[PDB]
Structure formats: C-alpha cells, structure tokens
C-alpha cells in the first residue's frame, strides 16, 4: 500500500520525469495491462522479478548515458529500486522466487574445488540427484 | 504417473554410472541432505531449477569432455533430463518458476524494436511500473 519505498521511488522519479516524457514521442504504451495480468497470475513473481531486472540492468544504465544531467538521479532511483527488490525478496508473499539456494551454491563450490574429481563425483551421484527430484515431486503433492 | 520418466532417467544413468563410479576416488559426498532440505522448503523450485541447470551446463558437458567414449550415452541422459525438465515446467506445482512471462517478453521485444525511443519510453513509464508494483503487492496482500 502506502509504502515509504514506493513514495521514495515516486519522489525520486519526479525529478527526472519531464526529461523523458518530452522525449517519449510515440503513442503506444510499453507497459500494458497484459503485463499487469502476468503480475496477477501464477508467474507473477517471475514477471516482476524480470521487469525489475530489466529496469536495473538495461533501462536505467542506458538512460543514465542518454544524459549526465540526470545520472545522479538515475543512480539514486536505481539504488531505491534495488532496495525495494531486496525487501520484496525477503517477504515470501512478494518475490520469493529470487532467492537462491545456499545448498546449491555449496554444491557448486565443492564441485569447483574438486576439479576433475568433482566431475567424477557429481556424475557418480546423479542417482542421488534423481532420488531428490523424485522426492521433490512427492513432497509437492501433499 | 511420472515414475516412467524417472525410470527412463534411472535406466539411462545406470549404464554410465560405473564409468564415473570407478573414477570417483574421494571419500566425501557432494549432494547431501541439505540439498534435499532446500528442495523441500519455500525456495524448492529454485533449488531444483539450479541443480538441473548445474548438471546440464556444468557437470554433463565436462562429463562429455572427459568421457568421449560414452558421449552418446551422456547425450541421451542429458536429453532425458531436458525432457523431464520440460514436463515439470508444464505442471504448476513442480517447476512453475522456470516459466517466463509472455507479457515481459513482449515488453523487452518492443523495447528493442524502439531503440532510443525505447529507453525514453521505458523511463517515462517508470511511474506506471511503480503502480504495477503497488498493485502486485496489494493483490498478494
């Protein structure tokens, strides 16, 4: 609802709005209600996560360079959006899909340290993996 | 009734297991209960996704490189794992997290088709984006 972060994002954006609005010449809307539809549905988390990423990694760093006079405002918007994202991440109702598994990262790092042996081990343990996939499926049906 | 697709994967794997088993000299275990724990919690879709990816992208290509003499058997195993992935992705309680928003794909596609106008339009509509975030949050409650 009336979130501080949203108000922070809106306030910061209002400092650069005119600059982009005056340059936005085409009649079509980019962000359509179909986007809003996907946010509503069962892949809402993925949709929103991807849109946040798109603004943070594509739109804003490109916008930054379409003018230095707004660079500091776009950095600040970027920080605030990143902060929003990290916050949504930590609420299971919002962006739980962005959280990565530490057990997987531990697997990757052990594998890396083992080198050729990690290849032989990971493959040898592929039966373990299949068993876990099966368990995952079982647990998802309760 | 997916235990036939698992049966397949297990059968494909059983024929190459020993090639790696005899070369796996170290004592410890890579895939441990902590992983299965993660598969069982709120981030389980993500953990399973990343594991299937890890095997497809990191482990199996190296196994192919190390075991060219069974490379066909490994390709077979990889395609069965890929097939399984795709099936899980179609079932909303399995790998829903690998599905992409079509609406987002269209946004990215329009954005690229617009070039510099895309940057201007996307930034101009950042207010809309903030509204969409706000609706999303409300909806999720």
* Residue contact B39–A141, C-beta within 8 A: no
Give the gap in angstroms from C-alpha B60 to the nearest C-alpha of chain A: 8
- What lies within 8 Å, CB to CB, of B118 at 6+ separation is A30, B110, B111, B112
Burial bucket for residue A61 (CB in 10 Å: 0-12, 13-18, 19+):
middle
- Buried b / exposed e along B80-115 (16+ C-beta atoms within 10 A): bbeebbeebbeeeebbbbbeebebbeebbebbeebe
CB contacts under 8 A, A 9-28 vs B, are 9-10, 13, 16-17, 20-21, 23-26, 28
**At the top level of CATH, which class does the domain A1-142 belong to?**
mainly alpha
Q: Are B54 and A125 in contact (CB under 8 A)?
A: no
Closest by CA position to B81, among listed B45, B47, B55? B55
Residue ranges of domains in chain B: 1-141
Burial bucket for residue A142 (CB in 10 Å: 0-12, 13-18, 19+):
exposed
A 10 A CB-CB count for A72 gives 12
Resolution in A: 2.0
CATH architecture, domain defined by B1-141: Up-down Bundle (1.20)
> Is the sign of the CA dihedral B89, B48, B9, A123 positive or negative?
positive
């Amino acid at each position: 609802g009336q979130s501080h972060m949203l108000l922070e994002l809106r306030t910061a954006f209002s400092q650069v709005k005119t600059f982009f609005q005056t340059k936005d010449q085409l009649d079509n809307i980019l962000l359509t209600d179909s986007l809003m539809q996907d946010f509503k549905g069962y892949l809402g988390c993925q949709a929103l996560s991807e849109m946040i990423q798109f603004y943070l990694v594509e739109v804003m760093p490109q916008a930054e360079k379409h003018g230095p006079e707004i660079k500091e405002h776009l950095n600040s918007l970027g920080e605030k959006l990143k902060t929003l994202r990290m916050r949504l991440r930590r609420c299971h109702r919002f962006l739980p899909c962005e959280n990565k598994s530490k057990a997987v990262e531990q697997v990757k790092s052990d594998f890396n340290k083992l080198q050729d042996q990690g290849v032989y081990k990971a493959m040898n343990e592929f039966d373990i993996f299949i068993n876990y996939i099966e368990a995952y499926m079982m647990i998802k049906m309760k």
